[PDB]
Amino acid sequence: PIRVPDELPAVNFLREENVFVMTTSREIRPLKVLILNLMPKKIETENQFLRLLSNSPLQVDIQLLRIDAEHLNNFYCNFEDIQDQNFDGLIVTGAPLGLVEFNDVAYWPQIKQVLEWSKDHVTSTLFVCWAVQAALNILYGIPKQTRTEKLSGVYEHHILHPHALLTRGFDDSFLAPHSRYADFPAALIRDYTDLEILAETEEGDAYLFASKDKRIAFVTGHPEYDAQTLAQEFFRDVEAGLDPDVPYNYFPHNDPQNTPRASWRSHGNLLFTNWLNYYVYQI
Amino acid sequence: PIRVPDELPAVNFLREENVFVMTTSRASGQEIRPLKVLILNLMPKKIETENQFLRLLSNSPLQVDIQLLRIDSRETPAEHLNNFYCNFEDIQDQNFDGLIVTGAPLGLVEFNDVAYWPQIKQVLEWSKDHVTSTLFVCWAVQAALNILYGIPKQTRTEKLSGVYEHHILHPHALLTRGFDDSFLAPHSRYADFPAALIRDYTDLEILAETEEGDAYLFASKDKRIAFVTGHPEYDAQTLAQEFFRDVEAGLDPDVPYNYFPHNDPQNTPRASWRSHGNLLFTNWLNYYVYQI
């Protein structure tokens, strides 16, 4: 935050827009961030999250958590290894569990254990994609909701709170990618949770939402994705004989031979910078 | 920056995209000292300009101690300048982490005829030894291209006024980190900034261009100087207020390009360039003023 003279007009003006300002009148520590990686492609997923978390002057000490091979043995800790530690941040990734009932998810008990533990041990937890479905069940009792057809593509969103911290810097309307069977109706989520809805798709899905105490935050797309991530899912779904739809608004001229761009990069960077600055660190 | 195990694949993979990564075996902390940032405000609307730049500089966990520098005594919100601005002589003997030199209404004014030209040259000569990184905005780019590189004033035949398409040139550059390949930024300038010509005369890195080949962003490899030729600090309404002022002055201006909904000046403009103004100033503070 800036430090300016007490009477500078900016003090009251920026405070009115929810900007913290220090004045001439009136500590630094490494942050501990745990990542619970449930994604099938562990290394790609590590690279995507750690790129966004490295874009900060804050020292972010990363611990990788497995729910429960050489790569995992070398770089990941188990829950028991860290159950006595406190963290400034926890990221729970997505997982390919859109079509799986909670009671058929092999490690459902271990996920419940981590989320119940986060209540006392983690300042701010961020839930991504399927982890939102999981957290809405375990924290708020909301049943699994499933769409008829997969949402796969780069969608138009709008912000709801001009002065909100988590959407600080965001354009009034912006792109973010989705790849999910999970359904996330915003009006229903608001009713059942009283969480603040910070961004929505044009069709009324919740994209971003969080608690006013900043302990929990939810993102239902994949703004951490590389340009090519949805292309790889597509070609995989083709070769598996699922006969998928081309992801929406993704390939130049909707031709899968053309090179996709990361048209959603900007608001992924803003999201993670905002999460670290205002939720994990807390100005 | 992150700290990860030494052999984690992300270490070599992120270093290859120009991302600084620390490891178990080799790491250092965030530097604890507050940053010192000086703003040379040459804009006519002193308070609106303070609010716009201070909004972007406050969006950071880094403590940024701000000093406001006036270039002249000449009278103007006279009392505001007396209460809140220092003179050059007040900060002559100090070092700063950053200096912003704002734009100014001097696009149609020869350098000869700029009352405070000697004070501008004085500050830019002083910045070489006293400021880690200096950012030049809008007309200040024209001033700095003349004073640092001997490039004469280039002037467009018509004012560039509006919200334009740009592209980045360097996917892994620090100053454009997080930027989309294509993005919006506003311009309000008579000054001409052909990118190919500026690259020839300066050897600066061109980091973003407009679609008509103007330089938008460029910087020195040593990080001592950076240049932005538009106004990403502008509020939603700033271009509208310029337009209404110009019509009132009987200049009968064109509507700013791609700005008013339906191109109708009775409609409420949005800040469609907010995102990349935030990324720019966050990147300037993190990688140029602070230096990860």
What can be said about this structure in brief?
The structure is a homodimer. Chain A is an alpha/beta fold and 283 residues long. Chain A is 32% helix and 25% strand.
How far the N terminus sits from the C terminus of chain A, by CA atoms, comes to 8 Å
Radius of gyration of chain A: 19 Å
Label the CATH architecture of chain A: 3-Layer(aba) Sandwich
Helix share, percent of chain A: 25-40%
Largest sheet of chain A: 10 strands, mixed
* Helix run count of chain A: 9
Greatest chain-chain contact: A-B, 55 and 58 residues
What's the helix-strand series of chain A? Answer: EHEEHEHEHEHEHEEHEEEHH
Strands of chain A, total number = 12
Describe the strand arrangement of the main beta sheet of chain A, using strand numbers: 5-4-3-6-7-12-11-10-8-9
Subunit structure (chain B): Homodimer.
Family (chain B): Belongs to the MetA family.
GO biological process, one term (chain B): L-methionine biosynthetic process from homoserine via O-succinyl-L-homoserine and cystathionine
Binding site for substrate (chain B): 159, 188, 245
Can you walk me through this structure?
The structure is a homodimer. Chain A has helices spanning 9-16, 42-53, 70-75, 79-82, 108-121, 130-140, 186-193, 229-239, 265-281; strands spanning 2-4, 22-23, 31-36, 60-65, 76-77, 87-92, 122-128, 146-159, 173-182, 196-201, 206-210, 216-219. Chain A is α/β, with parallel strands linked by helices and 283 residues long. Chain A has a single domain (3-279), classed as 3-Layer(aba) Sandwich (Rossmann fold), CATH 3.40.50. In chain A, the strands form two sheets. Chain A has a ten-stranded mixed β-sheet with strand order 5-4-3-6-7-12-11-10-8-9, sandwiched between helices. In chain A, strands 1-2 form a two-stranded parallel sheet. The termini of chain A are close together. Chains A and B meet through strand 1, helix 1, helix 2, strand 4 and helix 9 of A and strand 1, helix 1, helix 2, strand 4 and helix 9 of B. Strand 1 of chain A pairs parallel with strand 4 (64-69) of chain B. Chain B: Its EC number is 2.3.1.46. Chain B: One of its GO terms (cellular component) is cytoplasm.
